[PDB]
UniProtKB/Swiss-Prot annotation, chains A, B, C, D, E, F, G, H, I:
Coiled coil location: none
CDD domains: PRX_1cys
Record-given protein name: Peroxiredoxin
Transmembrane segments: none
Note: The active site is a conserved redox-active cysteine residue, the peroxidatic cysteine (C(P)), which makes the nucleophilic attack on the peroxide substrate. The peroxide oxidizes the C(P)-SH to cysteine sulfenic acid (C(P)-SOH), which then reacts with another cysteine residue, the resolving cysteine (C(R)), to form a disulfide bridge. The disulfide is subsequently reduced by an appropriate electron donor to complete the catalytic cycle.
Length: 214, 214, 214, 214, 214, 214, 214, 214, 214
């Protein structure tokens, strides 16, 4: 699959029971961040779950629900979750999909070449079942949930306000926390941008690079 | 394509001339980070190029060569690079592929659904020409080259020292900047880990979760 | 495609916005001249745009609308048109198509063998959406818009009056600015042509070669 | 798969390392009994692992090496094996395959209809790599390793002594622990059986039903 | 065919006449055990028909009807049944299918690789026409009808009480004749188990290993 | 298969052991008569076996070996033959093929439509492996071995003396036991027949209907 | 085609005109015997036609109509029939098909290997258009219409009275002209056979071999 | 195409205009003779046109319209006809088809192997649009229109009188100008011919060879 | 097949034996005329055989061998030839093919639409195996061997002298018995034609219509 493509209609067994994706979340009017991990009872995967659990409320506060998956079975999932609770006193409270035969994984291209388990994939899906972003980190390198958070915050504001976010937003090197106006793509639109700048409605480096505050 | 797969043999037109990937870089013993952008003379893309140029030295220092691409032609590239010089006072010194008909973009799944241009993809390829990581951000959300920098540093380190990096390394919530020992996957490897900690030599939360300083 | 064939129904993105061909022009009861150029910011193409713009009203006055096409994206298109106004003090005012991946270019056979950009093609399409003439010039040789003007003028007169135009009309070596009567195709029509001679209403070299003043 | 067929060539990841089947055991001139279980950390499966461990040297003594499998991953396997040790005081010492995506399971028809995990299958393979017997029990009913043991004992004997084993051997209702001579299949063999009976060299109910002590 | 699949609808010729499977038995609200044997007038098969007849009423008590099959013809079946009667004073009173060309045998994978007759297959089918278990023993090794009885008793109780049976039930080494509660597969179910144990009607080794008496 | 074709190379299991046809007989410079019957222990079939046996030596003296075929197995064959000895005092001494699944039968078209057993087929094959005649009688109507004897005798003479045999030979209504000269098929051959008539070395009704004594 | 198959609907040109097979005969409620011969004006074929004509009334009596076939054309057929009358004092009065290109011949497998003309085939088709028997004799050996007469008489009685006919009926070596009762094929039928005999009205050698008079 | 088939529906361009074959003639109740010639301005072809023109009224009286064809274009046809007029003082008044790409020529098999022009083909087509005769002479040998005239006359009479014409009719060596009665093809027809013969309206050499005065 | 196409390699049965075409004739350095007739013992066909025999030596003299063919068998052929000898005192001495199944007839397209026998075809094949001319007359219209003779004579002369024969040669309306010079087909050949005339050698109507005495 690819960005812009609606998440496939699929039923999955999870630590919270059998659910329908993307329906289960879209009907609640929520976005969701599906992410995979190579295997239960593995170190990096464990650190990422602790990290994600420490941030679950931030994603939720934005209306984005985290949901995980690996090719292990649900009983292993629960025993691994219990391990995390008994040792790190952290209680995982988001669902984890048990993709028994890695069927959903393969469909989403989460399985690396010649492997039989997933890598570290991330799929941001909105309240309309649309895939908005995709990340494939390798098994040997843990992700940074803080960047994924910046990504989704940016994704929400882009949809809400109809603007684009610059590099490293809200800490862009050129315009700080200002947002970008989609570029004019017609002779007529170019005129409007120039008139808009004249009225002080927007700032710009050129007719195609306009920006402003939120 | 997917992680672990070898970058495809392709001849491309760049602002530094016609080259062949991944050969051009691998024969120089260099890694390379290929990244795409929707189009020349567009706001977000420009802020990303500025952001990349500011960090190019840090990438090259690690033996990773940046190279961009869009579906525009090479003459527009140089004209846009000239605009960046005349307006942002920085000179792009990394090659940029002119994927004229988006043949390469399509082969690398860079084209979002229903679009005729690329989104913001990133492919990290090592000196053996193997795709090590892939990122797909939408046109509306610029990337954060610092997270990508952290990604490649992690990748270089895991390849050179045979370790795995924990979530948000080197600032992990559990083991700070320490690295992780690939989990034992056999009864024997398990025994070796249990004894390995019987007398220093390594730290661990469990036999499958061992870590150390690098 | 070939002469006599209906211009294909297609949606195109231009400097004047999105338009459906041949619909956009055919419903105005106008003809259009679709011509392509290798790339934006290239010398020969620039000279042809200068040439076309200076002749635009001559085509428009004949009910013929010029529209360009390149494999570049629309933003470069506008940047280039801007360079043309700032350096050659010429204001391009005909739409230019941004055939992003050369989809239309390929369907129209505009891309040379072993190339990824268009050559210098021209398609004359009448108010019926019918292709009346096609021209394919290579990147290294600019066209001559005056010969194309003579082409369109001959085409319109041919349709309007039901006559044929001799070599180099209206400056033919044998009959000058006179036109040709489509040749008799039957025994009876041959007789009609002969009676139309000798105490006749027509000039001719033979029964199949009849001509007259327009 | 069906009886008499050759066990397919395949690479499997097990708790004892990666090996190739059937080669690994057949190249050693060994037999092996591959059996599956639905999933790690499930009750019936645990009672069967306990039961099998209690009988491993019984099968080994016969030259028959036991090897299990489920679609769980190896790390989960080792942990489950650890649980059995700390809660049932028994150390599983036979390898267990991690059929990550149920690839081998599907190949051997171990997956019941509508399921995404194995049922309780048993395959008896000899040193020639030939499947000598197959059992498919459902998830809800545990097997009986004693019947499987009787099964392999009869198989080993029939192979080395060229005899058949009656129902419930060595406790057959009709001939106790005596074995059966493969039935005469030609007029000539029938003759030599009637003659072998006349000289008390064999006991029989008829010419096709001859039996003897080992 | 595999466990869980519905037994195929087929018309078979038997010693009791022509009947349709699984209908003939399902419409009576009964289960049936279909088993095959290499050939009529062979020793091992004869010991099995004797063993089956002596246990036919115990199968019938549970509402399970035994029905045999071989690639021999009906006339031979009856003569063989007649032989058994005259030489072993046992009357066979279960139907035997004359699968003339082994068409049904092949559909059910009863014919060993490189063979022209069936092996010793056993199919347990419930009143809903669903295959609950399958067994394939080779020609050289007779089955043990008591293990099949244990298997069918477990199946019946499993379907009635919604429980699972432990290894060697009702003689399991760990819990004897006690049955197993299907393992909790969700976080919520696990909680119900922990509360069911601590002050409740449930014994357990862990939240996933719960059991009770019948 | 049809007359003229060489009998198919096939291995068959018979009451006299496994043999390869037609090799088994052709190597002995023998002809063979392969015939089938619906099933063992059936009336018409028993009457045909009694008749064949009473004529077996008659076929053998002509260098023709009889060999039966049934879709029954070999053990039933020997049992049925035993029944013939004990009830009719006749000792069957020709081999009978056990075509377990009717594979050879189907290859030779011996299975009537909608049936799963053979009809009453007869194939006469010569020492060269060539099928010389084919007969298909239905199950309800027994054959007459005397007519097959006539057929075989005529066949032998036809091959040895290059003559053809008339209707009901050697009791033909027109020429009794005299044989027929293959008809002249060329103008020249017709002349050498009209001559043979002249010097009375041939009798004839016409140039194409010549006959003589053996 | 094979016994039991419906005779193919086909139109044929004959010496008695064009007719539709098998309708022409079935609609009259009659049976027919279709027989072929290699070619007109050949000796064996001639003796066979003479032989058939002398028995036509006996076939007709039984409600069976003979009809010939060969690849010659109808004109030769009539000249040959004329030769037969002029030289043998016999008048052929049954239809003979002119299978011009051997299309029906090929359809019914009458053409021997490598030939372009039929062999001596015979098809007995009943009033239902069902092929009841088939015979393929070679060109060098004429048939015996008396055997086919015996065949058809048995076929009719069998169909009429629901009985089977023994070898050489009505001159069976064992039971003379008595007919056979189709063998009991079930345990129940066997019982009713034993009751029909022993203080009953049926003769038999065993329960499956019962016979009586008409 | 072949004799007996319907002439193909085709629109053709001729020296008399565009018409539809065979309709143009059939809807008028006229037959037509389509004849091809290799090329315009070729010697043999010219002598044949001169030849045809001299006999056109002969064909026309019989209701048969001649129409020519070659792969030349219509304008050349007219110039050639004009040439014929100016040099042979004869006026061609039959239409000639301009089969530009030889589409009809190929469909009618008028193109010899390895050629791209027609040979000298002749098609006689009746008022029912049925092809009645076909001739193919090579380029090097001119035809003889008188034989085609005899052919069309015989063809017409045959259709009107329902008779066949002997060799070289009406100048047959055996029966002069008499016609032949189609041969009896059934026994019944043979009888009527012998009746008509014996004192009747029929002469003959045999029952299959009847003739009479027209 | 068409003109110029090589005659197919084929073995045929004829009244003169089995021969291979076109080899049999080509190897003798002879040409041959293959002609077919609908059926033996038919009127028109018989008149054509008589006609051909009377002219056989005329064809044979030109080195052309006649050979006939019908879908009848050889025996019937010989009897028909015998009838012609007995009644018309003429002896057929040319071979006649027995195309038993009409396979060669079909291959050469001698079978009219919806028929099962050949029509009246003629094929002239030269000593190189090339079909030089083809004629297809209907069953109802006899041919005229004198026209075929003219064709063959003209054919032999064109090959030998490299000239073309005008319409009705040697009785052409324009140039009588003179032959035609193949037309100049290049500017240079046109020159020499005019030169050839400038000084005797050839007579002409134009540069493309040149003729000379044979």
């Amino acid at each position: 699959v690819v960005i812009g493509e609606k998440f496939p209609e699929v039923e999955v067994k999870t630590t919270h029971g059998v659910i329908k994706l993307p329906d289960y979340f879209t009907k609640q009017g929520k976005w969701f961040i599906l992410f995979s991990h190579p295997a239960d009872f593995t170190p990096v995967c464990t650190t990422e779950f602790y990290g994600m659990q420490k941030r679950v409320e931030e994603f939720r506060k934005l209306g984005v629900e985290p949901i995980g998956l690996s090719v292990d079975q649900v009983f292993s999932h629960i025993k691994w979750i219990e391990w995390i609770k008994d040792n790190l006193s952290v209680e995982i409270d988001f669902p984890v999909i048990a993709d028994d035969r890695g069927e959903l994984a393969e469909k989403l291209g989460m399985i690396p070449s010649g492997a039989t388990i997933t890598a570290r994939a991330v799929f941001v899906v909105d309240d309309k079942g649309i895939i908005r972003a995709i990340v494939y980190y390798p098994a040997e390198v843990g992700r940074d949930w803080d960047e994924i958070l910046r990504l989704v915050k940016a994704l929400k504001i882009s949809t809400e306000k109809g603007v684009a976010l610059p590099h490293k937003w809200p800490n862009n090197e050129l315009i700080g926390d200002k947002v970008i106006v989609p570029p004019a793509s017609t002779i007529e639109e170019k005129k409007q941008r120039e008139e808009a700048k004249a009225k002080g409605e927007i700032e710009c480096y050129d007719w195609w690079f306009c920006y402003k505050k939120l």
